[PDB]
Amino acid sequence: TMCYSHTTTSRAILTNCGENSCYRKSRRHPPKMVLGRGCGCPPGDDYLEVKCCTSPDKCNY
Numbered sequence: 001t002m003c004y005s006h007t008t009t010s011r012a013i014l015t016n017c018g019e020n021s022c023y024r025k026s027r028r029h030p031p032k033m034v035l036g037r038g039c040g041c042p043p044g045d046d047y048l049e050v051k052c053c054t055s056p057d058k059c060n061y
Contacts, residue, residue, distance in 0.1 A: 002057040004037045009061055015039055021052045022060035 003022030005015035017039035025042065026034045028049040037060050041052035053059035 001054055001059065003039060003060050004058055005039075007034045007036060014058070021054045022058075023050055023052045024060040025050045 001017050001020070001022050002014045003017050004024075005013065015038060020039045021041050023036075023038060023041050024034065025036045025044070026032050026049050028044065028047060032049070035048065042050050044050040051060065
């Protein structure tokens with residue numbers, strides 16, 4: 001999958017994760033600010049929410 005790789009989606013740059021998933025990590029509790037995006041699927045906990053998707057491309061918006 002091609003994934004977004006930054007905390008903002010504005011910039012015209014992506015990461016080609018290949019066979020790996022995209023992730024989007026954010027604060028689980030409001031304000032739910034995005035803390036990072038990239039390849040793989042790191043573990044969440046009470047503070048951090050991590051969504052992981054394998055398609056379509058840029059699914060980690």
